[PDB]
RNA sequence: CAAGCUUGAGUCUCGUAGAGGGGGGUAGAAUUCCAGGUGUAGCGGUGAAAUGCGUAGAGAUCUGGAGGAAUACCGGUGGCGAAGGCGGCCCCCUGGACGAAGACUGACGCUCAGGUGCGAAAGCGUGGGGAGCAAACAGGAUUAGAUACCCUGGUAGUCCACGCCGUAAACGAUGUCGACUUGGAGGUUGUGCCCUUGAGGCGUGGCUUCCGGAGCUAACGCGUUAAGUCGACCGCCUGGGGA
């Protein structure tokens, strides 16, 4: 089931790490909907949220990078 | 874009008759209410209403007998981008005289058969079998 | 913009100009002016000392303010101008005190423009700057080999450097030429690539543009005698010499360079 | 895109009685409008075949309508072709 | 896939946990993937079929395979 | 006057620095009759991976209502000015005047 | 021809989702190359080899730098675009679509020979750029031969700028617009009500995938997104080659 219409999020946030962090896997990869369970239009927010982070080093890109 | 109302109406009668539809409904006009009128005289609908003020509604009652539709085969003569005018001679039958032709006469639409007993001719509208 | 001349006489066929409507159509300022008597590539004891120069037109020698040295004072571009010295275009700059110098017009530079050299300079193109101050990436033109010497490098029509590095006192400079030159921090360079890049663009079309430009033409040494020449000589055409110089240094591929006090600046040769 | 103010402005401008906005004249106008500001755009971005295709398809609307216009009423038309100063 | 060994923890299962972090992954799959250029009407075409295989799959267990088979 | 959202993240070294950088970002906005919704120093914080060969940076959030203009000439003094590494300029729809959640 | 009307078509208000387009920045991963360290005899490659790179120190491994190209995961018979097509993130300029109520304009519409524009890839022109990949070309195999398939290399080209080219199995092999006709399982994007008593319930729109009824079709199949039932307009076909 998805978590963001339960809570009923306006947006994603960026600066969210740790809600980020349930979404992606030990590698830092972005996990897929089907496994969440989120919905599509959720979805593609959390990726951007993501993204954003990787650019703003809040989340990594990949789990070897040093 | 809608280009021939009558042909529309006559198409939805079609699909009525196909899908066993107690009743056919589509926006109304004189040309079609006449038309209408004509087919209850001849006994191929059973019933005809026009309800409505700004946008009025023509709605037929469709007529069925030992389980299927009367109206066999109904087809425009007449087109937007073909008309049809034949002379009181000229006047075709309808399955030698079984079937009805719809036309549009000098002294309004009316049956073939009326047309000839007339006297006069005008634009076929269509065939109804 | 460049424009292809349409072929109405055979000379004119091929011709393509760089026509320019932001030049100024009238004279240069006359207290910059001074001078430029012709060579004929000749020197002190009037031998040729460099082939195929001479004739052309008379040209008038434009000061052109290399050094750039009006720190704090900004000036306020008047006027591009047609330099016949350079392939690049100039501009005449007038500093709010009230002197006018010439300087290199860099490419997005137009009239009304404000410029600015020092230490606290804007970066923006045609301001110059210590290149300790400009930030690492930049394209750079006009740029001192020694503090405070004058401009030397990337000087010409469209060229330009890149600040690769900056390390201590010398950063890195890519030249135009493809070779990687240390040059101290403390030299002065100017923001920007200089301006008249489609100066590549143009034709001659005709011998006599050619000859227009002081080039005089250029005999080919296998066409001479074998006393003119090392190429000179042979029934019909013939050359089984390996290619030289008219003094008989290998041409192709022969590396010249001697210079051994420099070659500690020279971080990677050209390619 | 026209921002609200300015269309509002139109519409106060070539409107024949309050906001009506449906009228034919204002839609012109605002079409025209449009067109002025996308010139600016287009003159910048030579490679905008997209965007142009939205421009073109506006330009058609706003002949549609001048041409309705002309059947309609030659005098208003000729005004609002005064107007906006376009020449036919 | 980083792995790092706990304390009091045999080799073997530390070996497999690292196994299926990389599964997890799908390392070697990628690797498989990237190992040729697959021109990308290929890719699609392989998409699709398998779009088509899930598809027609399903439609077999549910509704072709609910009858006596003996 | 659109709505913007600025995060950057300062060298480590120069943290007793971000304070003045950031009045005179605030400065930059009042001039152009520009508001600022909300302002959060986060502080030294430590990476996820190495920018630039460092492990912490300093980390600003900053909601502005401005101009473009403004924010084009922040962006640029952000590019030149070399103790900010990383900055991120964001459009955004409201004023968002509440709390992160890093700082809630 | 004259006056009207609001259902077609369009305008306005507020939102909505989107790899729609153009321009400018930037980020991380990886390949390659360059400089240096560590270190020693192989590496690479294949069906098996060899050419090739290696004791002039390769491959491997760490550090630092350079540059180009492309954006893992998300990612989906998901989305947007007229089609071609479009995929990291951010900003600037910008086209379209949909819904929600209302308010307005009042047939302003549909189609379109000629015409104009856009139009994958490859190619061509001028100037850049050039990592990887790779026509051509070279060498090694394979083979009866191998101007191929496989391997080691490798130049145009691929990338950018502005022009040209105007073609593809440019395909849904299905022209465009409109109306009507049993259903089911989805996906996606809105929106109205309902105790959201919970991820829900009842609706109502837009776009879309599969299955299928009537009907149609030579059959295959298509089947409310029709290849059904009809209307409007255009394009095109007339045995196979030659072509
Ligand atoms: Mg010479
Ligand atoms: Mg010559
Ligand atoms: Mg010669
Ligand atoms: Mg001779
Ligand atoms: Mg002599
Ligand atoms: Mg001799
Ligand atoms: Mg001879
Ligand atoms: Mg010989
Ligand atoms: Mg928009
Ligand atoms: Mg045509
Ligand atoms: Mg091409
Ligand atoms: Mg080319
Ligand atoms: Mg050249
Ligand atoms: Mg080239
Ligand atoms: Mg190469
Ligand atoms: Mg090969
Ligand atoms: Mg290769
Ligand atoms: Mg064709
Ligand atoms: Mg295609
Ligand atoms: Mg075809
Ligand atoms: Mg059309
Ligand atoms: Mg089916």
Not at chain 3, 167 to 176: C, F, H, K, P, S
Request: proline residues 4%; hydrophobic residues 35%; glycine residues 8%.
């Amino acid at each position: 089931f998805c978590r963001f219409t339960a809570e009923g999020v306006q947006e994603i946030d960026y600066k969210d790490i740790a809600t980020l962090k349930n979404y992606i896997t030990e590698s830092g990869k972005i996990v897929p909907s089907r496994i969440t369970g989120t919905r599509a239009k959720y979805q593609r927010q959390l990726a951007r949220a993501i993204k954003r982070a990787r650019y703003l080093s809040l989340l990594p890109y990949t789990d070897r990078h040093q | 874009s809608m280009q021939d109302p009558i042909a529309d109406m006559l198409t939805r009668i079609r699909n009525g008759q196909a899908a066993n539809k107690a009743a056919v409904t589509m926006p109304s006009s004189k040309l079609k209410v006449a038309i209408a009128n004509v087919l209850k005289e001849e006994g191929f609908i059973e019933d005809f209403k026009v309800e409505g003020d700004t946008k009025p509604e023509l709605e037929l009652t469709l007529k069925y007998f030992q389980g299927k539709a009367v109206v066999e085969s109904i087809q425009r003569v007449s087109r937007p981008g073909l008309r049809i005018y034949k002379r009181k001679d000229e006047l075709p039958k309808v399955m030698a005289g079984l079937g009805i032709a719809v036309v549009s006469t000098s002294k309004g639409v009316m049956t073939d058969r009326a047309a000839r007993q007339a006297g006069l001719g005008g634009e076929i509208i269509c065939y109804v079998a | 913009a460049v424009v292809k001349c349409k072929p109405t006489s055979p000379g004119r066929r091929h011709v393509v100009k760089v026509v320019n409507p932001e030049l100024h159509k009238g004279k240069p300022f006359a207290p910059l002016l001074e001078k430029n008597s012709k060579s004929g590539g000749r020197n002190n004891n009037g031998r040729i000392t460099t082939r195929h120069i001479g004739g052309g037109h008379k040209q008038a020698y434009r000061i052109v303010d290399f050094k750039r040295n009006k720190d704090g004072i900004p000036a306020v571009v008047e006027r591009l101008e047609y330099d016949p010295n350079r392939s690049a275009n100039i501009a005449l700059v007038l500093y709010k005190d009230g002197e006018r110098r010439y300087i290199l017009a860099p490419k997005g530079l137009k009239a009304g423009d404000q410029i600015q050299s020092g230490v606290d300079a804007a970066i923006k193109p045609g301001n110059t700057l210590p290149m300790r101050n400009i930030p690492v990436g930049s394209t750079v033109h006009n740029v001192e080999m020694k503090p405070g010497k004058g401009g030397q490098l990337a000087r010409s029509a469209g060229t330009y450097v890149q600040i690769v590095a900056r390390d201590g006192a010398y950063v890195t400079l890519r030249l135009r030429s493809g070779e990687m030159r240390k040059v101290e921090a403390d030299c002065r360079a100017t923001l920007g690539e200089v301006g008249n890049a489609e100066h590549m663009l143009r034709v001659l079309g005709k011998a006599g543009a050619a000859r227009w430009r002081g080039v005089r033409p250029t005999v080919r040494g296998t066409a001479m005698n074998p006393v003119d020449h090392p190429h000179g000589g042979g029934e019909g055409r013939n050359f089984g010499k390996h290619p030289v110089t008219p003094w008989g240094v290998q041409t192709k591929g022969k590396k010249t360079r001697s210079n051994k006090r420099t070659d500690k600046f020279i971080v990677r040769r050209r390619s | 895109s026209l921002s609200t103010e300015a269309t509002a402005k139109i519409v106060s401008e070539f409107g024949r009685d309050a906001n009506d906005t449906g009228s034919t004249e204002v839609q012109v106008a605002l079409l025209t409008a449009q067109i002025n500001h996308l010139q600016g755009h287009f003159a910048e971005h030579k490679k905008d075949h997209h965007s142009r295709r939205g421009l073109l398809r506006m330009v058609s609307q706003r002949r549609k309508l001048l041409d309705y216009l002309k059947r309609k009423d030659v005098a208003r038309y000729t005004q609002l072709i005064e107007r906006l100063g376009l020449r036919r | 896939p980083v792995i790092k060994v706990r304390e009091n923890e045999p080799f073997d299962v530390a070996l497999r946990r690292f196994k299926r972090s990389c599964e997890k992954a799908g390392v070697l799959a990628e690797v498989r993937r990237r190992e040729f250029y697959e021109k990308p009407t290929t890719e699609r075409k392989r998409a699709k079929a398998s779009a088509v295989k899930r598809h027609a799959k399903k439609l077999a267990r549910e509704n072709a395979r609910r009858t006596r088979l003996y | 006057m659109r709505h913007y959202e600025i995060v950057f993240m300062v060298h480590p070294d120069q943290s007793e620095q971000v304070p003045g950088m950031i009045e005179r970002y605030t400065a930059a906005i009042t001039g152009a009759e520009g508001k600022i919704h909300r302002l959060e120093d986060w502080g030294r914080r430590q990476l996820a991976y190495p920018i630039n060969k460092l492990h912490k940076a300093h980390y600003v959030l900053m909601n502005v209502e401005a101009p473009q203009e403004v924010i084009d000439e922040l962006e640029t003094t952000f590019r030149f000015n070399d103790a900010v590494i990383r900055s991120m300029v964001m459009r955004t729809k409201h004023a968002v005047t509440e709390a992160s959640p890093m700082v809630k």
